[PDB]
Amino acid sequence: LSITHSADWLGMRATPAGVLYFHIHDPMIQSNLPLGLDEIEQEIFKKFKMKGLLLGDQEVVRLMDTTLQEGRSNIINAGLKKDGSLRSDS
Amino acid sequence: FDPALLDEATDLRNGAKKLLEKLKTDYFTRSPEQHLKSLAEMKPVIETL
Structure with missing residues (x-):
């Protein structure tokens, strides 16, 4: 719905970035x-x-985690290797 | 040599490694003084319980 109406709803056509769950708790x-x-x-x-x-x-990943330069992320379940490519466990 | 036996001895050695790491993480990631301090710290809570 967010993508299909993206152009109409707020201005321009968009591209699916991802679907994320946020665990609400006091760990x-x-x-x-x-x-x-x-x-x-x-x-x-x-x-x-x-x-x-x-x-x-x-x-996409860099946008979701602007701190991530190399290695694993602490915000999104994805990572960037030394080579720079998205790592497979993402 | 013998690939089976070759790869088996390494398993035994790694077994020794895991045992040691387990011993370490169990008892020796904190000083005995730190351990005792934690233990003593928990005393009032036990008394409430």
């Missing part, structure tokens, strides 16, 4: 290693990585 961190406050905050953050489906593009 508990189960760590065997002692964590500083920043590291804890980071783990809590990681617990909110969105599952779903994406469109395989350097542009």
Whole structure:
């Protein structure tokens, strides 16, 4: 619906970027290693990585996670390798 | 050599590795002092329970 009406609804025709689920909860961190406050905050953050489906593009993933330069993302279930291509586990 | 035996000995060695890592993550990711501090910290909650 969002794509089919995209041109009419707000202005121009669009392209499916992805469908994402956001888990609403207050997670508990189960760590065997002692964590500083920043590291804890980071783990809590990681617990909110969105599952779903994406469109395989350097542009798409980078747009969804502008922090991601190389490796795995903590927001979207996708990653960028050193070569730059989308990694297969995405 | 013997590919079966060759690849089997490595399994045994990796077995030793996993055992050690398990021992480490179990008891030695925190100092004994840290462990005891955590334990002592939990005391008031137990008393409430």
